[model samples]
Target: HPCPWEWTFFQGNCYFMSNSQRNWHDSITACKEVGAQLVVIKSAEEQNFLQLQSSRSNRFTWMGLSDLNQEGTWQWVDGSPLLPSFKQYWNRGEPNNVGEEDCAEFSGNGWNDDKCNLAKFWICKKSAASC
Candidate 1:
């Protein structure tokens, strides 16, 4: 049996996947409980890394960015707009408010907004080992 992933830390953001699964708001709550919010990409390198991770293991996962919390004004969970932190690997014409779609997930190329609990592999950024 596989372990139910609660959260995963990658690049530089903390992520959380629900067991019972929830909406974007619920997912956000899960992350907040652990002293971290959803994950966010900041660089092209990190985006590539996320794309690799997402493609290698799974096809999708909830990241730390979305337009739900604000809609049109898309921003990372940390309140930062998409920056040049990682390669912009968007699947073209993405982040489209195509209905009730919210929460963002890292695709093989870039990020896309999708249904919250659509069952995709996820990750979270963890505290770097104290150097």
Candidate 2:
């Protein structure tokens, strides 16, 4: 597969970690400009890969996840619902909705609900192109 320059390929997808920070909405636009979308973690392995990468970068990064459209109903940017089993990745007491945290970020070893307006690093993902 042919992944873009600087993009990391794994498990049939390519991921790009951003160097600059931006608010959730702006981050989405930035990813779109690159022909990708904000990273949507689909499984334990995928989450682990991102978590490890984020840890190496030592940055709190945005993922394509939120309950923005309807509170308590988290959905991926791709319009897919978060699976119940995946809730294990959430940090203790997360998605508490404190101050209307409608966006989710990769923090430490788990996920954290955060306000959409807060600027943060982000990750983008897309399928790896066939060579």
Candidate 3:
């Protein structure tokens, strides 16, 4: 099925990489306003796609991951816990919780835990309509 204008189609979903930056909570609400949600990277393939896209833009982009509900227990916006298998993507010695860095961002070819209040670019995702 066709994705909305300006949204990129990949795999089985549609993604929107924002031009403007916003804090984690603001990013979440922004995506919801457009009938989407902050992107949930559930696979290596999906993560690779996002990484490539982010590298092109060369920006630290907020993703749908955070431990705001409970420090040290990260989960996606959809309520799925971050899988142990995906932990490999985190940069070495990351998610350190320094200065209460609880939100996740795609940066430097890896994931980083950053402050939720820091403004940064973000990605959004939603299912493509069935044809």
Candidate 4:
């Protein structure tokens, strides 16, 4: 894992889980400033790892999932749609997109759709250049 001094390395990427909270807009800007993106949980293993990272502080951390463009049609920050076969771990009755919430957040348990304007801690991920 070729991560910086404080970054957590898993699989082929480096993740930075923030302790401070910010709105999705600000959070994504923060991630972009570091050449990363809000985490895109592609598998159970990745989701579990990220969940654990956020659980350390008992906070709900934002992920890259969103349905900002077309309501109810979620996609990752990379513009990838949730694959049909990809397992969804959303909290029960979640993604109600309550109040038209359009962003995604996760805990050690599962995901919840929330308003993007709501401030929350976030996780950022970038591919490690070296192993």
Candidate 5:
């Protein structure tokens, strides 16, 4: 099935990052507005694309992964788990559940939980499967 929205393929699935500065929740809304979800990378291939994404990044970018929605159990906004495949790029002690930070973002190596309120760069994923 073809979704009316086009998938912007990056790591594997069609994806894109938000250029506007926004917090996690706002970021989610931003992506949804465009018919996409914050990027949820869970594989090496995805990490490779992220490597490129970081080099292109000036500071940071939001992803779909987060624990704020539920402490201890980190999940993508799409409800995807932080799989072993996702282990490839975790900042040391990341998703640490530290303080108010709870949203996930591809900080290059893996994922680092950070304050979702802080506006930064972001990525979103859209797939044909949803259509």
Candidate 6:
């Protein structure tokens, strides 16, 4: 499946990071507006792609990872847990549930748990049409 223009191709999926900034919830809305969801990386290859999404300002980019309601029980926005079949990329000790932290952000070091209301850039992901 080929990806649309301006979108990166990766394992039958299309990836694109927003040039603008938004909080986790707003970021989710932004992605949904474009027919995608906040990127839900499931493999090392996907993490490579996510790592490449770093911004010049060094601000974290929001992923679909979060444990908003139940502390320590991380899950994607679609309510999918981090299954054993998938890889986890936490930065040292993450998803710490410290302060207001719950949302996951991508950093140069790795993934970190941050406050969902904090504004930042974000990545979107969706499946490419197989034709």
lDDT by candidate, in order shown? 0.61, 0.91, 0.92, 0.84, 0.70, 0.80
Worst 10 residues of 4 by lDDT: 83-92
Which tens-of-lDDT digit does each residue in 1-131 have in candidate 2? 87878888989999989989999999999999988899998888999999988877789999999999999999999999999999999989887999899999998888999999999999999888742
Deviation from native of the Cα of residue 80 in model 3, angstroms:
0.6
Candidate 3 stretches greater than 4 Å from native: none
Per-residue C-alpha lDDT of model 6 across residues 1-131, encoded as one tens digit per residue:
78877887878888876778899999898888888989887777788766765634476799998878788778988877977544357777765768879998987657788888988888899988732
Please give me the total number of clashing residue pairs in predicted model 3: 0
Model 2 stretches with alpha carbons more than 4 Å out: none
On lDDT, the candidate that comes out on top is 3
TM-scores for candidates 1 onward, in order: 0.67, 0.94, 0.94, 0.90, 0.77, 0.84
TM-score, candidate number 1: 0.67
Where is the poorest 10-residue window by lDDT in model 6? Answer: 83-92
Name every residue pair that clashes in candidate 4.
Answer: none
TM-score of 6: 0.84
Cα error, residue 30 of model 4, in Å, equals: 0.5
TM-score ranking from best candidate downward: 3, 2, 4, 6, 5, 1
Flag the better candidate by TM-score, 2 or 6. Answer: 2
Model number with the top TM-score = 3
lDDT of 5 by residue, 40-60 (tens): 666677677765766566557
**Model 6: residues >4 Å from true position, as ranges?**
55-59, 84-88
Tens digits of per-residue lDDT for model 1, 4-123: 255445543434443444456565666666665556666666667667767765456677776666676667777888654332466788767577677787766667788765655545
Task: Name the candidate, 1 or 3, with the larger TM-score value.
Answer: 3
| RMSD after Cα superposition, model 4 | 1.8
Better of 1 and 5 by TM-score: 5
Q: Model 6, residue 90: displacement in angstroms?
A: 0.8
Each candidate's clash count: 20, 0, 0, 0, 8, 0
